[PDB]
Amino acid sequence: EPTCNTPSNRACWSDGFDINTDYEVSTPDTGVTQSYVFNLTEVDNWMGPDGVVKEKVMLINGNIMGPNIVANWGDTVEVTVINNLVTNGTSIHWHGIHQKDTNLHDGANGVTECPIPPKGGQRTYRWRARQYGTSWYHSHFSAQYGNGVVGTIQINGPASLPYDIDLGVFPITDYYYRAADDLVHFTQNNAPPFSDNVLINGTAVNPNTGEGQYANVTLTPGKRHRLRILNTSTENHFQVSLVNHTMTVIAADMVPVNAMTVDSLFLAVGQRYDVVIDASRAPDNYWFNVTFGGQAACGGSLNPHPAAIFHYAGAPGGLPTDEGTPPVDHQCLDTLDVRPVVPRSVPVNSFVKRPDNTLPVALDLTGTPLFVWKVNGSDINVDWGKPIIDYILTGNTSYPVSDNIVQVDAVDQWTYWLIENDPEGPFSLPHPMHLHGHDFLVLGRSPDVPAASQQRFVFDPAVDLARLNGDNPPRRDTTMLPAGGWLLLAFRTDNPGAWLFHCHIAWHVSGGLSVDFLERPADLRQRISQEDEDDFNRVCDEWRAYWPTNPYPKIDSGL
Ligand SMILES: *[C@@H]1O[C@H](CO)[C@@H](O[C@@H]2O[C@H](CO)[C@@H](O[C@@H]3O[C@H](CO[C@H]4O[C@H](CO[C@@H]5O[C@H](CO)[C@@H](O)[C@H](O)[C@@H]5O)[C@@H](O)[C@H](O[C@H]5O[C@H](CO)[C@@H](O)[C@H](O)[C@@H]5O)[C@@H]4O)[C@@H](O)[C@H](O[C@H]4O[C@H](CO)[C@@H](O)[C@H](O)[C@@H]4O)[C@@H]3O)[C@H](O)[C@H]2NC(C)=O)[C@H](O)[C@H]1NC(C)=O
Ligand SMILES: *[C@@H]1O[C@H](CO)[C@@H](O[C@@H]2O[C@H](CO)[C@@H](O[C@@H]3O[C@H](CO)[C@@H](O)[C@H](O[C@H]4O[C@H](CO)[C@@H](O)[C@H](O)[C@@H]4O[C@H]4O[C@H](CO)[C@@H](O)[C@H](O)[C@@H]4O)[C@@H]3O)[C@H](O)[C@H]2NC(C)=O)[C@H](O)[C@H]1NC(C)=O
Ligand SMILES: *[C@@H]1O[C@H](CO)[C@@H](O[C@@H]2O[C@H](CO)[C@@H](O[C@@H]3O[C@H](CO)[C@@H](O)[C@H](O)[C@@H]3O)[C@H](O)[C@H]2NC(C)=O)[C@H](O)[C@H]1NC(C)=O
Ligand SMILES: *[C@@H]1O[C@H](CO)[C@@H](O[C@@H]2O[C@H](CO)[C@@H](O)[C@H](O)[C@H]2NC(C)=O)[C@H](O)[C@H]1NC(C)=O
Ligand SMILES: *[C@@H]1O[C@H](CO)[C@@H](O[C@@H]2O[C@H](CO)[C@@H](O)[C@H](O)[C@H]2NC(C)=O)[C@H](O)[C@H]1NC(C)=O
Ligand SMILES: *[C@@H]1O[C@H](CO)[C@@H](O)[C@H](O)[C@H]1NC(C)=O
Ligand SMILES: *[C@@H]1O[C@H](CO)[C@@H](O)[C@H](O)[C@H]1NC(C)=O
Ligand SMILES: [Cl-]
Ligand SMILES: [Cu+2]
Ligand SMILES: [Cu+2]
Ligand SMILES: [Cu+2]
Ligand SMILES: [Cu+2]
Known part of the structure; x- marks a missing residue:
């Protein structure tokens, strides 16, 4: 923990660790672990903070929000999640926590794990605090976190x-x-x-x-x-x-x-x-x-x-x-x-739009339901009963098209992605894009214009290569996709696993706005411990046994 972090010198932390330390490759080991237990209940006719009684809410330990997670840079955070909801399965994703080499603790149901079954199901998440700052956690079981399964994370540091x-x-x-x-x-x-x-x-x-x-x-x-x-x-x-x-x-x-x-x-x-x-x-x-x-x-x-x-x-x-x-x-x-x-520095002079580095976002109004979001022709739809990780563990490469698997084999290299926001459709909306497992670099986006003007743009080298910036650009896990425009991001393949890249508006991801970056699949299996594997199979077995008895059907993508 801290030793030299003072009011007039917050840059200092401990010997060998300060504000200039590359926290992405060097972590202090404190040997300390911060534990928590999450009890999820379904409460009917709950009175909210403004006076109105909501019909139903889902709470962690009976409070509007789960407990504030608090730890020091380098500690281990452990949370036992006990699912006491009536029908819903559940998964807690730690938004902002890259989960380096711990993909199976990301909490992406249908991707890195089956949901924890209701009425008593449990599973313990465990990840290292390799980054200091402010983050949060929430359910990824459809839009469930909209009922209350959410909380904050505060990892102290410089x-x-x-x-x-x-x-x-x-x-x-x-x-x-x-x-x-x-x-x-x-x-x-x-x-x-x-x-x-x-x-x-x-x-x-x-x-x-x-x-x-x-x-x-x-x-x-x-x-x-x-x-x-x-x-x-x-x-x-x-x-x-x-x-x-x-x-x-x-x-x-x-x-x-x-x-x-x-x-x-x-x-x-x-x-x-x-x-x-x-x-x-x-x-x-x-x-x-x-x-x-x-x-x-x-x-x-x-x-x-x-x-x-x-x-x-x-x-x-x-x-x-x-x-x-x-x-x-x-x-x-x-x-x-x-x-x-x-800082970070990545070349942008050599970028070139291609089918395998472009993710076109589109709104499909021709099917059912009316509003269906698709990326590169498909609305994502994961299987809660057989996540992508199960394919990895069984040498199965028959990934269904619905999983929107974008395989990236590159080893520890920068990958570029151009996301196009329905430049050709009836209308385009702003979309907050988010990536699990990494902090991407915002290399650039289309020109800033009024969000409702309905102006469109399509990446054009003759004018935009000059607009891109790879000299220590903003680095983070969430950024805006201009309405009717495009966005160019980059992230280094330094963390094998299946990582979701979706829009964080519940209604949209639910509708299908998402892809699944299968990063370095060949290296992935060799890095999954017997314990994460067995427990993965354990929770999946319990979930598969439960589902058939669920009184409700899955209405959206499951994300
Ligand atoms: C996780 O746990 C959750 C908590 O239990 C659970 O959620 C519940 O899921 C069930 C099943 O999916 C829901 O019940 C079904 O709801 C269907 C839709 O009803 C709601 O919408 C109606 C209309 O709303 C829209 O209207 C616009 C136009 O204005 C349309 O364009 C749009 O398409 C919609 O139609 C509305 O009339 C309903 O009102 C009733 O319910 C609400 C909520 O309970 C209540 O506030 C109202 O006062 C009123 O009572 C809803 O808002 C509905 O179609 C289903 O009923 C049909 O199907 C059944 C079975 O097939 C059939 O028997 C019926 O005859 C009918 O045809 C059904 O009621 C329930 O609403 C959810 N509860 C909550 C609080 O969210 C999750 O399902 C669970 N997840 C998993 C995977 O298990
Ligand atoms: C930050 O948050 C605080 C707390 O919420 C905000 O404080 C509130 O500010 C609003 C003003 O926007 C204020 O509401 C006014 O209360 C007055 C009480 O008598 C009303 O007279 C007034 O009505 C006029 O303005 C409305 C627009 O808000 C109109 O819809 C309405 O028709 C009235 O318009 C008359 O006046 C205009 C010009 O003055 C004229 O053109 C019209 O023809 C007409 O004659 C508002 O209802 C709240 O009382 C404040 N709340 C508190 C507790 O202080 C604050 O505004 C926020 N600040 C920012 C920058 O966002
Ligand atoms: C927001 O929270 C602050 C912090 O508690 C509240 O401030 C406190 O306000 C009370 C009165 O509202 C102060 O007490 C008063 O002090 C005067 C002067 O001695 C005395 O004459 C009054 O009888 C009363 O005791 C109190 O000192 C003050 N706290 C501090 C340290 O600032 C504030 O009221 C809260 N605001 C709202 C909207 O609730
Ligand atoms: C989007 O889907 C298209 C398929 O329509 C993919 O494009 C193909 O990509 C391969 C590999 O680069 C090429 O050999 C084919 O020629 C491409 N086909 C087309 C449409 O020209 C594309 O890879 C997908 N994009 C992503 C990032 O998933
Ligand atoms: C690989 O995974 C796929 C899932 O996409 C498996 O396919 C299912 O196999 C069962 C047979 O046990 C069938 O009943 C299902 O209808 C199949 N679904 C699909 C999508 O085809 C497949 O069996 C697995 N086997 C491999 C390739 O290793
Ligand atoms: C969760 O809390 C509810 C009430 O707050 C209680 O009935 C239930 O037994 C608890 N479950 C566990 C295992 O903590
Ligand atoms: C938010 O509320 C909690 C208790 O409800 C309080 O301890 C905390 O200080 C509040 N945040 C701030 C900085 O006001
Ligand atoms: Cl994340
Ligand atoms: Cu999130
Ligand atoms: Cu996330
Ligand atoms: Cu969106
Ligand atoms: Cu997510």
Whole structure:
């Protein structure tokens, strides 16, 4: 753990480990393990934080969110998940945790494991904390995490800027009264709805009844505070800001970045931002605002002004008085100005669009249901009863077309992927793309234009090769795919396994927007221990025995 990490020197951690250490290839071994136990229950007619009683929710240990995972850079995190839901199977994915050589602990049901059966099923996840920062976890059993199976992850380590207080996690999520399975069914033939409310750190005031309450953050006058903001929504994409205050980003997702002071921030579904706010203003109460932009192209809420209160220690304690000015419209796009502390460099002068490096996203309105998302001609649909890893363990290469298997044999090399966002269809929407097992490099994207303008673009070397940047570009696990445009990413094949690459909007991945990167399959088998294998077969045997008795059918892709 830490020894030299002080308020005025956060760059220091322990001998041989600091903010400049390449955390991707060097990990401190503390020999320490942090354990947790997740009890999943299905609660009917549960009263929410704003006053409304939801029809049904799924909770980890009876709370709106699971427990905050907390550990030090280099420790081992272990979580026993006991599934006490009535019918649903379940899987907990650790969003942001690359799972280096531990693919079978990724929590991607139908891909790296069968779901943990209901009514008592259990399985223990175990992974090493090889990266420090802020992340989160959630179910991957369809849109289940929309009912409550979600929580945060805080792995301590160095920082690119000194600060006095670490305020901790600050999850911002959209909140719907209807249940995930109902919304999934609804979104298969209807446009997605606005969120009934937006929760800031678990709470919110009902805009109709006045019930509920504002999240209350207390700043220590004169001190610099670290705030870890996350967006754990199923659809809503946010914009945040603090009246009369700026924010200095020091981390994008779980990647530390050079200090970048901003006025507001756009956070896509699944993104995080570690910021340092300085209590240098007059003691008072200020509004922390959540606003939307991009003309509803990436979300909207029925609560016109979701917000929290930042109270200065010592000032009166009422509601803030200054409503402030609306932040700039970020047009459903994240900033590409972030520069990671630990650099990366990849050539882009030699890129060339090809069928095997291009992933065309399309919306198919000709079949059933109405809204079906496809990538390279197919809507993904995994088999909960026979994940891809089972094929790997049985020398079976007959992968069904539905699994959208994109095999990458390259050994520890940079791979380039151009994702095209339905440039030829009726209409295109912004899509937050996310990759399991790695942090990709955002080499570039189509020109920034209003998200609703419906302008289209198609990669054109004559103009775009000049727009690409491979000189330490933003590195992270989630970034925005411009509406009607394209996006060029890159990730190094340093981690054998089956990795999902999907859109994090629940409604979409559910509808099929996803592929499965089968990375270095030949090296994969040799690296799966007898234990992960046996337990894999164990959980799969229990799930296969259960399924036939399930009273419900699988309605979507299962992801
Ligand atoms: C994991 O665990 C989950 C929790 O139990 C579980 O979810 C439940 O799944 C079951 C089965 O899939 C669901 O029940 C089915 O729901 C079907 C759809 O009903 C809902 O939508 C109706 C219309 O909504 C849309 O409307 C637009 C237009 O406006 C259309 O374009 C769109 O296509 C949709 O039609 C709506 O009328 C329903 O309202 C009722 O239910 C809701 C939710 O319970 C409630 O709030 C309302 O007040 C009202 O009671 C729903 O919103 C429905 O078609 C099914 O019924 C048909 O099929 C059965 C069997 O085939 C047949 O007997 C019937 O006669 C009928 O033909 C059925 O009711 C249930 O809603 C889910 N519960 C929740 C809370 O999410 C998961 O299934 C489980 N996962 C797995 C894999 O096990
Ligand atoms: C950050 O979050 C906080 C907390 O949620 C936000 O604070 C709220 O801010 C809104 C203002 O947008 C405020 O609502 C007003 O309350 C007044 C109470 O009397 C109303 O008079 C006022 O109504 C007018 O504005 C509405 C638009 O919001 C119109 O729909 C309505 O028709 C009214 O319009 C009149 O005035 C305009 C110009 O002034 C004129 O053109 C029209 O013809 C008409 O005459 C609002 O309802 C809440 O009271 C605030 N909540 C609290 C507890 O303070 C804050 O806005 C957020 N800040 C940012 C930057 O997002
Ligand atoms: C948000 O949380 C903060 C932190 O607890 C709350 O601040 C506290 O507010 C109360 C009053 O609202 C303060 O107490 C008051 O102090 C005055 C001065 O001594 C006294 O005259 C009053 O009778 C009362 O005791 C308290 O000091 C203050 N805490 C600090 C250290 O700032 C705030 O009220 C919360 N806001 C909301 C909307 O709930
Ligand atoms: C998308 O699917 C197409 C099949 O239609 C794949 O394209 C083929 O790729 C192989 C290997 O590079 C080539 O030999 C064929 O000539 C390609 N066919 C076409 C359409 O020209 C493509 O690889 C898939 N893309 C991804 C990344 O999965
Ligand atoms: C490889 O995996 C496939 C799954 O895609 C297996 O195919 C199934 O085999 C059973 C027979 O035991 C049939 O009842 C199913 O209908 C088959 N489904 C498909 C998709 O064909 C296959 O048996 C496995 N065997 C290999 C190739 O090793
Ligand atoms: C989970 O919690 C519920 C109630 O909170 C309890 O009934 C059940 O026995 C618990 N399951 C386990 C094994 O923890
Ligand atoms: C979020 O809420 C928890 C308890 O509900 C609190 O301990 C934490 O400090 C809050 N986050 C911040 C930084 O306000
Ligand atoms: Cl991930
Ligand atoms: Cu995620
Ligand atoms: Cu993930
Ligand atoms: Cu999407
Ligand atoms: Cu995922």
